Amino acid sequence: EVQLQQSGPELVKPGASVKISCKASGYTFTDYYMNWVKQSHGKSLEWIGNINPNNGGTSYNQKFKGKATLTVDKSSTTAYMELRSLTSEDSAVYYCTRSPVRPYYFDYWGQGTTLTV
Amino acid sequence: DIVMTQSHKFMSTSVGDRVSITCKASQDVSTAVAWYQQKPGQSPKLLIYSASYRYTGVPDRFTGSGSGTDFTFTISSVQAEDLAVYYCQQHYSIPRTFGGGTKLEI
Amino acid sequence: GERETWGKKVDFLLSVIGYAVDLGNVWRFPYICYQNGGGAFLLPYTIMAIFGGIPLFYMELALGQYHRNGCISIWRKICPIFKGIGYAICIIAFYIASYYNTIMAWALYYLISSFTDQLPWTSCKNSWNTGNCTNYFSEDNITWTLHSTSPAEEFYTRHVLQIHRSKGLQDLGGISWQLALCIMLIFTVIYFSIWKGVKTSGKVVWVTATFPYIILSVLLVRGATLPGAWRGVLFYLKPNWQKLLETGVWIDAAAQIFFSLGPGFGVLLAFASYNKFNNNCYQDALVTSVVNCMTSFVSGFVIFTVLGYMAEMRNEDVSEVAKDAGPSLLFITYAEAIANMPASTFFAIIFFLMLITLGLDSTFAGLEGVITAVLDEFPHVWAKRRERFVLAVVITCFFGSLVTLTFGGAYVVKLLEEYATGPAVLTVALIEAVAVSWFYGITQFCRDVKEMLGFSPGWFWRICWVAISPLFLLFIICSFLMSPPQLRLFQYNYPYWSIILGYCIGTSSFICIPTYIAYRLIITPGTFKERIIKSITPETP
Ligand SMILES: CCCCCCCCCCCCO[C@@H]1O[C@H](CO)[C@@H](O[C@H]2O[C@H](CO)[C@@H](O)[C@H](O)[C@H]2O)[C@H](O)[C@H]1O
Ligand SMILES: Fc1ccc([C@@H]2CCNC[C@H]2COc2ccc3c(c2)OCO3)cc1
Ligand SMILES: *[C@@H]1O[C@H](CO)[C@@H](O)[C@H](O)[C@H]1NC(C)=O
Ligand SMILES: *[C@@H]1O[C@H](CO)[C@@H](O)[C@H](O)[C@H]1NC(C)=O
Ligand SMILES: [Cl-]
């Protein structure tokens, strides 16, 4: 009843920079977080960052210092994640997730952008 | 970080028995352990948060148990629509970390 | 001749202890210690205390005991070109008595509001609460929206402080009468307790400086029994040795020890002024610093056992609930923790009494320092009626703190806490240690201490007075002036005019030193060498 839409598959040149958009719709967008998770090919999940649409706050993973920047534009309720300096080692599916503040359960997940290097 | 492991990725009993996979935690997490159900190709849906409360809109068969260090996912008599992998996420501290997972064959 | 002595030698020790211990050892030390590696913070803390704190403390105490003068009259015996130190200290003490005397007013409001079997900040069906009043967890079924807030946080930001009536620092809105009455009562208490002097001060310090320890012990005993209390102690003591590689831990340790011991402020000079000549100030300063550090440690245990209880009742990671640094850690987090413990009324009463008694003696000492300084500076117009000039300074400090009692008071008190004290006090203490250890001569000081105590201080003290502590304070100053902090409070940033006003306030006291050495041009005219040789050398004893 409440699904998060994302982009589709694309080809990224190794070394360039790309973005992944997450258009949320169904509930009050300015009321919960917007978390990104990186699922490697046939491996475990991994939490990348955190976005607070109220004040543009951020809380990213320690192993993602200069790997992904997180921005938010609450005009059309979208979430941007720019992937800079991408090589053939982390190009995999990217999910957009929402989660309330500190029960921290991932409530809804995106469709799955199979980002291929 | 707070690493979270699971059992072997193959051992899973067939229909009729009790398929109960475990989740060993590195540090002491009181009850902040969630479970997910990612079918092949689809996106992971939330099943159980805080290891004892199931999310709204899930069947009554999916039950979670355990606290402190040993967390058990109790899904007994799996139907023909539960073949997936189940991850073990904790709500202790940032960054949050998931687990390896296990398939339920057959 | 005219100076007075302490009624008992224990009165001086208790007064210096009560000056050294304050809320900065209750809510400022545990947060800094946990953030900067946890248990591994005790090593840089101890190093910066041995090298930076204790030497300055002991030097200041010995100087104030020998010269027997305040922060203004002593500089006629060391370097009359640094006489503006007293006026700068007066300005800084005015700013501090303006801002710091509001935390105690908030504590007094909480105390007079806690007199009920059911505390106000444990419910949500009140007249000050909006729809975001989500009670404490007590369960994990109820979710938490990003706009949801705890009942105690809403009671603190909408009833005791009333921050929702002010749209920020741009407009304070209006002054409240409740906080005004509480701060008036506390200023009246301070005045009726500091009027006569050290002889009356040391008699109230017996209760004001010893009561916090009984309450701290009671809270420790209560916290060590709560379920899940071991998590807080573990997270507070589990070291993170990877943090010690960053300079931020050492900078924070230096700042914390300098603001916990508080040297170079004229309070220690004034307290040692009323002391005996042959008093062993060495043992006094040593035991005072040790008591201050042990009190910081005990209070860290007390706070973190209760935060561990909260992280067990609520979700874990005390680091998450202890997200903010300030009075909110005591008025929001610990308030919830008290309201959720059995027999909450008595614990809230004693906790707020502990806060009030921790602030009271600190304000006592901070005002007595300036009083003694200006009295020993102007004995012809004052010091004949000491009952006066104390009411005047209390009224001035009350009129200056009235601006903090407004609805937008948290912003103003944080602006005065983050700009008026740190760099100004650091520069004042640095230039004071330079004037005492270099211009006054470390040989004239070591022979002096040898004459008073009966033994010259060791070479370690000369090293810590000549090169270690000056470079220490210079390092703290260079670290603070290099990274201007963008402070925020309750999801509200500070504009650029706020930073400009804070820079003007922080320099509104240090600027009093150069203007004195400049305006002295009329007093002692002549060649430049004449002034350089007549302003460094002290007057004839
Ligand atoms: C030399 C003459 C100086 C004249 C006055 C100059 C004043 C300049 C404006 C104020 C300067 C910044 O003021 C000072 O900023 C530092 C960080 O920079 C703040 O410091 C804050 O962050 C640091 C980490 O960086 C912590 O270690 C510290 O405990 C915390 O308070 C101080 O709380 C504030 O007092
Ligand atoms: F810049 C700083 C100087 C001294 C400190 C002190 C260090 C020791 N522990 C208590 C701290 C508060 O001292 C006070 C309290 C009330 C006052 C005051 C000083 O002057 C008039 O009214 C902190 C900061
Ligand atoms: C809390 O959630 C559990 C999870 O299924 C449910 O069984 C229980 O009835 C809930 N209690 C409430 C809503 O009071
Ligand atoms: C919580 O506050 C926000 C803005 O501060 C407001 O929009 C929202 O309606 C509030 N929640 C409720 C339940 O009223
Ligand atoms: Cl301390």
Author numbering:
A (entry chain B): 20 to 136
B (entry chain C): 21 to 126
C (entry chain A): 77 to 617
From the paper:
5-HT is cleared from synapses and taken into presynaptic neurons by the serotonin transporter (SERT), thus terminating serotonergic signaling. SERT resides in the plasma membrane of neurons and belongs to a family of neurotransmitter sodium symporters (NSSs) which also includes the dopamine (DAT) and norepinephrine transporters (NET). NSSs are twelve transmembrane spanning secondary active transporters which utilize sodium and chloride gradients to energize the transport of neurotransmitter across the membrane. SSRIs are competitive inhibitors that bind with high-affinity and specificity to a central substrate-binding site in SERT, preventing 5-HT binding and arresting SERT in an outward-open conformation.
The ΔN72/ΔC13 SERT variant used for cryo-EM is otherwise wild-type SERT which has been truncated at the N- and C-termini and yet retains transport and ligand-binding activities. Here, we employed a similar methodology using the ΔN72/ΔC13 SERT variant complexed with 8B6 Fab to study binding of paroxetine at the central site. The ~ 3.3 Å resolution map of the ΔN72/ΔC13 SERT-8B6 paroxetine complex allowed us to locate a density feature for the inhibitor at the central site. The density feature of paroxetine in the cryo-EM map at ~ 3.3 Å clearly resolved the larger benzodioxol and smaller fluorophenyl groups in subsite B and C, respectively. To compare paroxetine in the ABC vs. the ACB pose, we flexibly modeled paroxetine in both poses at the central site followed by real space refinement. We observed that in the ACB pose, paroxetine could be positioned with a CC of 0.70 compared with 0.84 for the ABC pose suggesting that while ABC pose is clearly preferred under the conditions we tested, the possibility of an ACB pose cannot be excluded. Based on the higher CC value, and the binding pose information from the ts2-inactive and ts3 SERT x-ray structures, the density in cryo-EM maps for paroxetine at the central site was interpreted to best accommodate ABC pose. We next compared the cryo-EM structure of the SERT-paroxetine complex to the X-ray structure of the ts3 SERT paroxetine complex. Overall comparison of the transporter revealed only minor variation between structures solved by each method, with a Cα root-mean-square-deviation (RMSD) of 0.68 Å. We also compared central site residues involved in paroxetine binding, finding that the best fit to the cryo-EM density revealed only minor differences in the side-chains of Asp98, Tyr176, and Phe335 when compared to the x-ray structure (all atom RMSD: 0.91 Å).
